[PDB]
């Protein structure tokens, strides 16, 4: 998704809500592959909820238009 919308600024993409949350989760998982003793280390992959939350918002508004569909996201945001 960086190479599609690589519109001059890279800091438009890297330091954002959707991206930083992913880099907090996925970068440790790549470190667990290279380092053999870091499988047992705690990785906050529970934060993927806030990414799945943001994944829903872009998906749902692809197509009232956003009365029932918006409120279903507002339940997801809380849960």
């Amino acid at each position: 998704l960086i190479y599609l919308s690589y519109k001059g600024n890279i800091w438009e993409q890297i330091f954002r809500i959707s991206f930083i949350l992913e880099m907090i989760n996925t970068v440790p998982f790549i470190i667990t592959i290279f380092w053999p003793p870091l499988r047992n280390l705690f990785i906050p992959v529970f934060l993927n909820c806030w990414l799945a939350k943001y994944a829903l918002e872009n998906m749902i508004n692809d197509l009232q238009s956003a009365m029932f569909n918006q409120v279903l996201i507002l339940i997801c945001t809380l849960l």
Binding site: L1, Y3, L4, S5
Partner: peptide
Amino acid sequence: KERLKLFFIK
């Protein structure tokens, strides 16, 4: 850039 861009976003 050319191939994947027409299928991802557009």
